[PDB]
Design an enzyme around this catalytic site. Structure first.
Site, PDB file in Angstrom:
ATOM      1  N   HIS A 161      22.860   1.412  13.156  1.00 35.97           N
ATOM      2  CA  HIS A 161      24.161   1.965  13.575  1.00 35.97           C
ATOM      3  C   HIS A 161      24.515   1.452  14.959  1.00 35.97           C
ATOM      4  CE1 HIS A 161      23.163   4.782  10.338  1.00 35.97           C
ATOM      5  NE2 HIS A 161      22.064   5.091  11.001  1.00 35.97           N
ATOM      6  N   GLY A 171      -0.750  -1.458   8.816  1.00 40.17           N
ATOM      7  CA  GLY A 171      -0.229  -0.119   8.622  1.00 40.17           C
ATOM      8  C   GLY A 171       0.700   0.374   9.704  1.00 40.17           C
ATOM      9  N   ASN A 181       0.758  -1.251   0.000  1.00 36.98           N
ATOM     10  CA  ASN A 181       0.000   0.000   0.000  1.00 36.98           C
ATOM     11  C   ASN A 181       0.803   1.325   0.000  1.00 36.98           C
ATOM     12  OD1 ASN A 181      -2.360   1.481  -0.238  1.00 36.98           O
ATOM     13  ND2 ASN A 181      -3.406   0.196   1.298  1.00 36.98           N
ATOM     14  N   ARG A 188       5.407  -8.723  20.272  1.00 40.85           N
ATOM     15  CA  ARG A 188       5.351  -9.938  21.068  1.00 40.85           C
ATOM     16  C   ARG A 188       4.241 -10.797  20.465  1.00 40.85           C
ATOM     17  NH1 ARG A 188       0.872 -10.402  25.076  1.00 40.85           N
ATOM     18  NH2 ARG A 188      -0.378  -8.463  25.048  1.00 40.85           N
TER      19      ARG A 188
HETATM   20  C1  ACO Z   1      -2.831  -4.435   3.773  1.00 43.32           C
HETATM   21  C2  ACO Z   1      -3.830  -3.278   3.694  1.00 43.32           C
HETATM   22  O1  ACO Z   1      -3.803  -2.556   2.667  1.00 43.32           O
HETATM   23  S1  ACO Z   1      -5.240  -3.207   4.797  1.00 43.32           S
HETATM   24  C3  ACO Z   1      -4.767  -3.184   6.522  1.00 43.32           C
HETATM   25  C4  ACO Z   1      -4.862  -1.842   7.282  1.00 43.32           C
HETATM   26  N1  ACO Z   1      -5.413  -1.994   8.596  1.00 43.32           N
HETATM   27  C5  ACO Z   1      -4.684  -2.547   9.643  1.00 43.32           C
HETATM   28  O2  ACO Z   1      -3.461  -2.382   9.681  1.00 43.32           O
HETATM   29  C6  ACO Z   1      -5.400  -3.022  10.847  1.00 43.32           C
HETATM   30  C7  ACO Z   1      -4.513  -3.625  11.951  1.00 43.32           C
HETATM   31  N2  ACO Z   1      -4.860  -4.980  12.358  1.00 43.32           N
HETATM   32  C8  ACO Z   1      -5.171  -5.290  13.779  1.00 43.32           C
HETATM   33  O3  ACO Z   1      -4.905  -4.499  14.622  1.00 43.32           O
HETATM   34  C9  ACO Z   1      -5.511  -6.679  14.173  1.00 43.32           C
HETATM   35  O4  ACO Z   1      -6.894  -6.830  13.977  1.00 43.32           O
HETATM   36  C10 ACO Z   1      -5.156  -7.055  15.632  1.00 43.32           C
HETATM   37  C11 ACO Z   1      -3.684  -7.399  15.744  1.00 43.32           C
HETATM   38  C12 ACO Z   1      -5.478  -5.845  16.544  1.00 43.32           C
HETATM   39  C13 ACO Z   1      -5.970  -8.243  16.028  1.00 43.32           C
HETATM   40  O5  ACO Z   1      -7.350  -8.005  16.403  1.00 43.32           O
HETATM   41  P1  ACO Z   1      -8.157  -9.051  17.324  1.00 43.32           P
HETATM   42  O6  ACO Z   1      -7.219  -9.726  18.255  1.00 43.32           O
HETATM   43  O7  ACO Z   1      -8.929 -10.037  16.473  1.00 43.32           O
HETATM   44  O8  ACO Z   1      -9.105  -8.192  18.161  1.00 43.32           O
HETATM   45  P2  ACO Z   1      -8.886  -7.876  19.665  1.00 43.32           P
HETATM   46  O9  ACO Z   1      -8.775  -6.395  19.876  1.00 43.32           O
HETATM   47  O10 ACO Z   1     -10.140  -8.431  20.367  1.00 43.32           O
HETATM   48  O11 ACO Z   1      -7.623  -8.611  20.225  1.00 43.32           O
HETATM   49  C14 ACO Z   1      -6.525  -7.851  20.619  1.00 43.32           C
HETATM   50  C15 ACO Z   1      -5.549  -8.438  21.497  1.00 43.32           C
HETATM   51  O12 ACO Z   1      -4.257  -8.045  21.045  1.00 43.32           O
HETATM   52  C16 ACO Z   1      -4.053  -6.775  21.523  1.00 43.32           C
HETATM   53  N3  ACO Z   1      -3.936  -5.820  20.427  1.00 43.32           N
HETATM   54  C17 ACO Z   1      -4.886  -5.394  19.612  1.00 43.32           C
HETATM   55  N4  ACO Z   1      -4.337  -4.553  18.716  1.00 43.32           N
HETATM   56  C18 ACO Z   1      -3.016  -4.476  18.967  1.00 43.32           C
HETATM   57  C19 ACO Z   1      -1.952  -3.795  18.395  1.00 43.32           C
HETATM   58  N5  ACO Z   1      -2.151  -2.959  17.288  1.00 43.32           N
HETATM   59  N6  ACO Z   1      -0.718  -3.930  18.904  1.00 43.32           N
HETATM   60  C20 ACO Z   1      -0.512  -4.729  19.957  1.00 43.32           C
HETATM   61  N7  ACO Z   1      -1.505  -5.393  20.526  1.00 43.32           N
HETATM   62  C21 ACO Z   1      -2.754  -5.291  20.057  1.00 43.32           C
HETATM   63  C22 ACO Z   1      -5.096  -6.497  22.533  1.00 43.32           C
HETATM   64  O13 ACO Z   1      -4.446  -6.061  23.658  1.00 43.32           O
HETATM   65  C23 ACO Z   1      -5.589  -7.804  22.804  1.00 43.32           C
HETATM   66  O14 ACO Z   1      -4.577  -8.355  23.577  1.00 43.32           O
HETATM   67  P3  ACO Z   1      -4.837  -8.995  24.973  1.00 43.32           P
HETATM   68  O15 ACO Z   1      -6.204  -9.487  25.065  1.00 43.32           O
HETATM   69  O16 ACO Z   1      -3.846 -10.119  25.145  1.00 43.32           O
HETATM   70  O17 ACO Z   1      -4.512  -7.983  25.990  1.00 43.32           O
HETATM   71  C1  ACO Z   2      19.485   6.657  10.965  1.00 43.82           C
HETATM   72  C2  ACO Z   2      18.821   5.677   9.996  1.00 43.82           C
HETATM   73  O1  ACO Z   2      18.184   6.194   9.043  1.00 43.82           O
HETATM   74  S1  ACO Z   2      18.674   3.923  10.399  1.00 43.82           S
HETATM   75  C3  ACO Z   2      16.985   3.439   9.981  1.00 43.82           C
HETATM   76  C4  ACO Z   2      16.053   3.098  11.165  1.00 43.82           C
HETATM   77  N1  ACO Z   2      16.554   2.089  12.045  1.00 43.82           N
HETATM   78  C5  ACO Z   2      16.167   2.024  13.375  1.00 43.82           C
HETATM   79  O2  ACO Z   2      15.236   2.702  13.795  1.00 43.82           O
HETATM   80  C6  ACO Z   2      16.895   1.148  14.298  1.00 43.82           C
HETATM   81  C7  ACO Z   2      16.320   1.260  15.706  1.00 43.82           C
HETATM   82  N2  ACO Z   2      16.897   0.422  16.719  1.00 43.82           N
HETATM   83  C8  ACO Z   2      16.069   0.005  17.864  1.00 43.82           C
HETATM   84  O3  ACO Z   2      14.937   0.323  17.917  1.00 43.82           O
HETATM   85  C9  ACO Z   2      16.636  -1.009  18.775  1.00 43.82           C
HETATM   86  O4  ACO Z   2      15.609  -1.692  19.449  1.00 43.82           O
HETATM   87  C10 ACO Z   2      17.701  -0.465  19.759  1.00 43.82           C
HETATM   88  C11 ACO Z   2      18.377   0.792  19.249  1.00 43.82           C
HETATM   89  C12 ACO Z   2      17.043  -0.174  21.133  1.00 43.82           C
HETATM   90  C13 ACO Z   2      18.739  -1.510  19.881  1.00 43.82           C
HETATM   91  O5  ACO Z   2      18.468  -2.596  20.772  1.00 43.82           O
HETATM   92  P1  ACO Z   2      19.739  -3.400  21.296  1.00 43.82           P
HETATM   93  O6  ACO Z   2      20.418  -2.586  22.333  1.00 43.82           O
HETATM   94  O7  ACO Z   2      20.669  -3.723  20.142  1.00 43.82           O
HETATM   95  O8  ACO Z   2      19.226  -4.673  21.974  1.00 43.82           O
HETATM   96  P2  ACO Z   2      17.904  -4.821  22.780  1.00 43.82           P
HETATM   97  O9  ACO Z   2      16.758  -5.150  21.896  1.00 43.82           O
HETATM   98  O10 ACO Z   2      18.221  -5.976  23.732  1.00 43.82           O
HETATM   99  O11 ACO Z   2      17.605  -3.582  23.667  1.00 43.82           O
HETATM  100  C14 ACO Z   2      17.127  -3.780  24.959  1.00 43.82           C
HETATM  101  C15 ACO Z   2      15.919  -3.145  25.415  1.00 43.82           C
HETATM  102  O12 ACO Z   2      15.407  -2.363  24.343  1.00 43.82           O
HETATM  103  C16 ACO Z   2      14.074  -2.621  24.284  1.00 43.82           C
HETATM  104  N3  ACO Z   2      13.567  -2.224  22.972  1.00 43.82           N
HETATM  105  C17 ACO Z   2      13.989  -2.618  21.779  1.00 43.82           C
HETATM  106  N4  ACO Z   2      13.278  -1.972  20.842  1.00 43.82           N
HETATM  107  C18 ACO Z   2      12.421  -1.154  21.463  1.00 43.82           C
HETATM  108  C19 ACO Z   2      11.463  -0.256  21.033  1.00 43.82           C
HETATM  109  N5  ACO Z   2      11.243  -0.075  19.658  1.00 43.82           N
HETATM  110  N6  ACO Z   2      10.747   0.439  21.932  1.00 43.82           N
HETATM  111  C20 ACO Z   2      10.966   0.271  23.238  1.00 43.82           C
HETATM  112  N7  ACO Z   2      11.877  -0.580  23.674  1.00 43.82           N
HETATM  113  C21 ACO Z   2      12.611  -1.291  22.820  1.00 43.82           C
HETATM  114  C22 ACO Z   2      13.936  -4.046  24.677  1.00 43.82           C
HETATM  115  O13 ACO Z   2      12.660  -4.307  25.124  1.00 43.82           O
HETATM  116  C23 ACO Z   2      14.921  -4.163  25.727  1.00 43.82           C
HETATM  117  O14 ACO Z   2      14.357  -3.862  26.981  1.00 43.82           O
HETATM  118  P3  ACO Z   2      14.741  -4.552  28.343  1.00 43.82           P
HETATM  119  O15 ACO Z   2      16.039  -5.200  28.290  1.00 43.82           O
HETATM  120  O16 ACO Z   2      14.709  -3.468  29.379  1.00 43.82           O
HETATM  121  O17 ACO Z   2      13.695  -5.505  28.735  1.00 43.82           O
HETATM  122 CL    CL Z   3       8.783 -11.231  17.583  1.00 46.33          CL
END
Ligand code: ACO
Ligand code: ACO
Ligand code: CL
Ligand code: ACO
Ligand code: ACO
Ligand code: ACO
Ligand code: ACO
Ligand code: CL
Ligand code: CL
Ligand code: MG
Lengths: 183, 183, 183, 183, 184, 182
Positions: D111, D138, D81, D176
């Site tokens: 980096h 998305g 998309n 996750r």
């Molecule tokens: C390809 C294209 O051109 S079209 C696509 C454009 N639209 C999209 O991107 C829509 C995004 N898709 C969705 O978000 C999905 O439907 C999902 C992942 C939210 C799944 O929905 P469902 O699980 O069936 O519904 P529901 O809300 O009841 O379940 C959600 C569960 O996952 C969690 N959850 C829902 N959305 C998200 C999210 N975006 N990120 C993380 N967790 C999420 C909820 O916490 C719940 O988790 P839990 O019960 O363990 O706490």
């Molecule tokens: C400049 C350019 O144009 S480059 C293009 C774009 N590239 C990027 O954005 C790269 C981004 N890098 C990240 O997001 C990575 O997750 C980094 C920088 C945090 C690197 O992670 P690393 O240090 O190598 O390892 P790691 O994943 O173990 O990091 C550890 C912690 O970061 C957390 N973490 C990783 N990604 C995320 C995130 N997106 N948001 C929040 N927390 C994060 C983990 O949960 C972990 O937490 P914890 O140990 O306290 O439980």
């Molecule tokens: Cl994963």
């Protein structure tokens, strides 16, 4: 009979007729992309969609202007320079190894001398035919229903109202025979 | 000589040469940017990239059409109006204080009258020269290897096939002397 | 009066005057919008900001080039074809049921035959009028101060330097009377 | 190996290599023509010149953002998309029947956390692989060295840092495992 | 004279955005962004970017498409790289230091509105500056909110929302951002 | 019931159907024309052509991306910032005095979690309604079938999966209720 077909056939027609308008948009869109494009292959490709036919190894330099496009047919090894305007309500058919100068005009379209008959913008189109190995200079007007004979040359800034025999140089407004090019 | 060298020097040349094609591409781009500019200082600076020279206080109104740009050299206090077309395979030199009307054409390119020498799009380019204090009307065609003499004027819609004497008024197709501008 | 007023009234003026520059700038912005527009409704809307007046059911085809736009008044049921150039320093007035073919030139601007009077790009502007039901062909030049009489026709590639009487056909450079159209 | 060869294997390459440089410019050219395309067929053609591969009946909605293009391979019947950004320093491979939502992000580059190891914009790239039948929502980020398991689904606004197993729903930052899709 | 509606904006006072000075700068930046974004010549892109921005440093680069509203309020140091699709709402100053790396699709929001719907109906807006210090790496898809300072040599995880000043030598992540590690 | 009709109303549909393809092609031309225009009154005029409706004194900043345009109705005194993406298979209805920040996404479309039922790009589009006086922040996702109650606020970078009550501040992915603004 479709208004479109009436136009192509040299009879009276309504320009606001829908199929015609659509042709006109197709054409507008394509001119704009072709005209604003810097990729040579991209221009040729879109011209194959714009023109009725565009032959092998032929070039049409932007900006190029036309009204409908699909009525225009260009053969092989033919070259059309910049800033050409074609009023193409009737078929315009272009041979092989033809050269066309810049700012040259093809008008298939025409109007009546009587003002009472132009008040609805009434127009008649008649086809233009350019045979093989012709060289049309720049700033030339070729009017409706003309045929240009093979291996003939049209001088810069001419206005061609009538057929040009083959193997001939013509010039002026209206164009006249200046010299025979036959061996 | 390189194919580019030949084109400049009025010899037969290969149009498809990489060197000639680079300049053609440079020109096309700058051309498109210049014709779409809303910013007069930007337009000047772009026109200084396109042309070989563009003098002090001179103006070139868009849209301007050319093939190579680099072979064009314009003097100071010179105004070239809209919709001009220049085929610049050969050098075009323009003096100071020149006035050029709209839709005027400069063709340094020509082809043989013999059709058998036109099949590979064979072209010959010879330079064009405009001297100081010339005024050129609109819709004028100026052909190859021509020098327009100082303080002369060219009537609108004229086509110039041979040198124009200075302090002279010329007109028609092909141009002829109309009056002496001498004092 | 202001420099703008002098230009309009036919006297020498200062092209770089802030009022005149500003209107030139307005027109340049509007022109690129219209010439690049793919919407007819918006295009027409655009043109009504560009021109002093655009009539009912009237029509102007892209691309179109002018200096100022707001000096031009166009009546009703009038059609202007592609690639037209108008130098519009002075008012250009066009009636109803008027037809203008591609690449026609309207010049209100002019300079003196004395080069000494041209080195500051000095320019006088004289109004051009086209009366009702006039038909103007392709690649025509109309020069400053000229009126074209009602129901008259100007042949292709003509240059009109003096008024054309009503109900007449004119052609040539300079255009001559060809025939009465009356009756 | 060639620098282009290094890059396709995900080996370190010189970004200012004549070869890479040329690829980067080619991609910039094509991105522009593709993103400004109003013609479907010609857009697909240009897209096949940009990408390493674009399979049968697949779709990439403009605007699309990428660096090199040639390193991206897309399978059959896969839809991508609008407003997608792909940092393609290393290969990105997408399978059949993949669906990718608007504004999604693919980063093969990153980096060091040591700021003293970033002063030269030092960058390491690692391949991304999207297997068959995947749905990426998305606004998602997929970081470097990741494989997304077949038939899997990634929730909107999710950030994926490591491999996602087949037949699985992930979501979150970092993503996750929400639930198993197998049954 | 007296404070302009443009002064007000830069200084985080309430301003009328429809003011002629503001519109002209919005017009200027809209023209330059378009030319920058469709530009195919490198030397030319930088020249125009120098026209867009308040400052753009030596050996620094901003990858098109780049989006901003005013341009002149933006300042960027030497050896700084900004990737594609970055959006900057720059009603107030945005100052980026040396050796900075900013990922794709990162958003910089100097702008904000009251949470009271009654105080939002004339589109009332307050902008507070953003400052990014030397040697900072911001990931892609990160949002940085108004009045934030990212201290030198820190890192913002991809897709993070930064609501609050970020300490130097620190790695942060999540929405809102929180400290993941000292990098000292 | 035509294919356009089925799309709009949350049934499967043939996206290559001529009505649908017509609207998409019109939207494509208009979006490009709007996004490349420097004339604010022109963009606005063009936008009255593209959208179902566009209220008095409302501003939609370029670039703006959508699929069909005519399914979008936006009220008076409403501002939508740069680089917003709308997938508008189903109607998207936006009230007066709404504020939408940069890069926000509205997805009326969705797919099945069963891959077997996505192999032909099957799609279902459910509407989205944003009520009066809502403030949506930047980088937010609003999923299909969702209504945002009046005078509510959405925190930046949130994903909204479900209706949001009036007078509320919500945030998170997925969005949670943060505080009442009542
Ligand atoms: C390809 C294209 O051109 S079209 C696509 C454009 N639209 C999209 O991107 C829509 C995004 N898709 C969705 O978000 C999905 O439907 C999902 C992942 C939210 C799944 O929905 P469902 O699980 O069936 O519904 P529901 O809300 O009841 O379940 C959600 C569960 O996952 C969690 N959850 C829902 N959305 C998200 C999210 N975006 N990120 C993380 N967790 C999420 C909820 O916490 C719940 O988790 P839990 O019960 O363990 O706490
Ligand atoms: C400049 C350019 O144009 S480059 C293009 C774009 N590239 C990027 O954005 C790269 C981004 N890098 C990240 O997001 C990575 O997750 C980094 C920088 C945090 C690197 O992670 P690393 O240090 O190598 O390892 P790691 O994943 O173990 O990091 C550890 C912690 O970061 C957390 N973490 C990783 N990604 C995320 C995130 N997106 N948001 C929040 N927390 C994060 C983990 O949960 C972990 O937490 P914890 O140990 O306290 O439980
Ligand atoms: Cl994963
Ligand atoms: C592919 C590209 O884009 S090429 C770029 C554009 N180039 C062109 O347009 C070049 C056009 N070429 C010309 O018009 C030339 O002047 C040519 C072809 C007529 C050459 O004419 P030549 O035969 O070589 O010489 P010459 O000057 O003697 O012409 C002979 C007659 O033509 C007349 N004549 C010459 N040019 C013209 C003209 N443009 N219009 C009308 N009559 C002309 C002369 O009056 C002369 O008349 P005469 O019968 O009384 O003796
Ligand atoms: C440069 C800028 O930015 S301005 C934009 C464009 N404007 C123009 O191009 C205007 C061009 N200027 C000319 O055409 C002028 O008419 C001039 C220079 C010839 C002036 O001549 P004038 O003496 O003032 O006018 P006038 O028409 O009376 O001249 C008469 C004779 O000239 C001849 N003549 C006039 N115009 C032309 C013409 N376009 N072509 C050929 N001959 C012409 C006629 O033959 C006429 O009759 P004649 O043969 O019996 O002598
Ligand atoms: C609104 C639009 O966009 S749509 C259409 C645009 N197309 C046009 O520009 C078409 C131009 N039409 C003309 O110029 C025509 O030649 C007309 C109307 C002047 C005359 O056509 P017709 O009367 O049917 O034919 P015809 O050739 O017999 O004309 C008669 C005389 O006019 C003279 N004449 C014809 N064309 C011209 C010309 N271009 N220049 C000068 N005189 C001419 C001829 O010498 C001819 O000979 P005569 O004087 O010895 O009697
Ligand atoms: C029309 C246009 O162009 S829009 C202009 C662009 N501007 C933006 O997009 C601004 C976005 N606004 C937000 O992100 C804000 O931070 C808001 C809406 C969360 C408001 O925060 P405030 O209430 O003013 O203060 P505060 O930062 O202390 O927020 C408190 C709660 O918000 C939470 N929070 C803050 N930001 C977020 C967020 N982005 N997502 C989820 N929760 C958040 C905190 O965790 C805290 O929760 P807790 O007390 O339960 O632990
Ligand atoms: Cl050939
Ligand atoms: Cl305001
Ligand atoms: Mg996330």
């Amino acid at each position: 009979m479709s208004e479109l077909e009436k136009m192509l056939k040299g009879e009276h027609f309504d320009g606001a007729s829908a199929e015609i308008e659509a042709l006109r948009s197709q054409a507008g869109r394509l001119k704009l992309e072709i005209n604003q494009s810097l990729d040579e292959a991209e221009r040729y490709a879109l011209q194959r969609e714009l023109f009725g036919h565009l032959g092998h190894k032929s070039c049409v330099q932007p900006p190029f202007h036309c009204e409908f496009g699909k009525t225009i047919r260009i053969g092989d090894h033919t070259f059309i320079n910049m800033n050409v305007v074609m009023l193409d309500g009737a078929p315009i058919t272009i041979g092989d190894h033809v050269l066309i100068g810049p700012s040259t005009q093809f008008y298939t379209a025409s109007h009546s001398l009587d003002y009472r008959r132009r008040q609805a913008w009434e127009t008649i189109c008649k086809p233009i035919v350019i045979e093989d190995d012709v060289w049309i200079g720049g700033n030339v007007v070729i009017n409706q229903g003309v045929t240009i004979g093979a291996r003939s040359v049209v001088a810069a800034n001419s206005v061609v109202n009538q057929d040009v025999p083959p193997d001939t140089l013509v010039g002026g407004t209206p164009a006249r025979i200046l010299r025979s090019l036959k061996d």
